């Protein structure tokens, strides 16, 4: 790859390979590392996106329309799947995520994370 | 075994500017995902550096933890693993420590704008 | 250690040469960056390499007109910078930071936060008409 790469943009990217139950593929994900990380680090932090299911069941799971952001499929934010990435796997870009959408991806993230101390 | 939020396990890591290879990391899930998901999520632990030179990093010492060398905590280098994965535990850190992770991971996550 | 100079007052449009060297320590094997300091703004990286020469980054506002380069025949480093602009006024920094390095990304030593091990003592860049 991108060339300005932001938190809740939506990227096409390559996960291959994996193991057991992580998510792996070229699959859609979410960009939650901060800006300043974006900009600078080699490496960007991304939550898994899945089509497999398409209504959130645990509290750290969230949702996206695809009446809404231009997706195949109704899809899954997985809070519980987060990977580094080298900024090579990020192959397109789909769109991004709103800021009232990022704030349930906030949630999710301090309830995966245990951040609440 | 039970996996704890804190815990330092020896992980094979292998195939990954990711970190790779079977290292320590250390539990940052939540403990309720830690009893009942298949994964659990983990930052990563370097050996190469001693010094967090920025603020998404933690330093632990070696005369206080079990430990090799004087370690770093890349809180910008985090992942999920499938608990098959955690080899052997090997400490866990201290509420003191994992309250300087939390910060890191709260930076590191850009859970700080506003 | 790390004393740098080449610091003026230009017109816009002129060009100067920084100039950034080390004593009692080998710059090749370290991570070097360029940084500026306007008043009131934040700590910008404008240039940075990693201890290879094969790793550079430029802030976009300083693409195409700053130019870095390592000279390891006098333990020196230089911030060539052309078509100044009255923006590009500030203290600019020299930041040196020993290996082992964590990632061989010049980008990465840029950010502005990253406590390099030395710092130079600093220089003002003044672009005015």
């Known amino acids: 790859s991108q060339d300005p790469i932001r938190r809740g943009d939506v990227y096409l990217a390559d996960l291959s390979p994996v193991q057991g139950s992580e998510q792996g593929g070229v699959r859609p994900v979410v960009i939650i590392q901060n800006d300043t990380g974006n900009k600078y680090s080699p490496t960007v932090i991304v939550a898994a996106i899945t089509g497999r299911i398409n209504k959130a069941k645990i509290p750290t799971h969230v949702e996206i329309e695809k009446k809404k952001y231009k997706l195949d499929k109704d899809s899954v934010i997985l809070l519980e799947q987060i990977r580094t990435l080298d900024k090579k796997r990020l192959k397109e870009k789909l769109t991004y995520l709103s800021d009232d959408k990022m704030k349930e991806v906030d949630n999710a993230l301090m309830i995966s994370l245990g951040l609440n101390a | 075994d039970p996996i704890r939020r804190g815990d330092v396990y020896l992980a094979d890591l292998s195939p990954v500017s990711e970190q790779g290879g079977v290292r320590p990391v250390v539990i940052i899930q939540n403990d309720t995902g830690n009893k009942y998901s298949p994964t659990v999520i983990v930052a990563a632990i370097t050996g190469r550096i001693n010094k967090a030179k920025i603020p998404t990093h933690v330093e632990i010492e070696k005369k206080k933890y079990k430990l090799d060398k004087d370690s770093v905590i890349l809180l910008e280098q985090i992942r999920t693993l499938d608990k098959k994965r955690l080899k052997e535990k090997l400490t866990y850190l201290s509420d003191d420590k994992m309250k300087e992770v939390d910060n890191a991971l709260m930076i590191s996550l850009g859970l700080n704008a506003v | 250690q790390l004393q740098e100079s080449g610091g003026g007052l230009v017109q816009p449009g002129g060009s100067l040469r920084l100039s950034c060297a080390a004593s009692?320590?080998?710059?090749?094997?370290?991570?070097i960056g360029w940084f500026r300091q306007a008043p009131g703004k934040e700590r910008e990286g404008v240039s940075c390499?990693?201890?290879?020469?094969?790793?550079?980054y430029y802030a976009d506002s300083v693409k195409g007109r700053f130019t870095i380069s390592r000279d390891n025949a006098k333990n020196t480093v230089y911030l060539e910078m052309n078509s100044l602009k009255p923006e590009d006024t500030a203290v600019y920094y020299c930041?040196?930071?020993?290996?082992?390095?964590?990632?061989?990304?010049?980008?990465?030593?840029?950010?502005?936060?990253?406590?390099?091990?030395?710092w130079g003592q600093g220089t003002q860049v003044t672009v005015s008409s």
């Open positions: 009692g320590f080998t710059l090749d094997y370290y991570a």
């Open positions: 930041a040196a930071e020993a290996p082992p390095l964590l990632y061989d990304s010049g980008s990465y030593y840029c950010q502005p936060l990253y406590q390099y091990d030395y």
């Open positions: 390499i990693s201890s290879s020469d094969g790793s550079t």
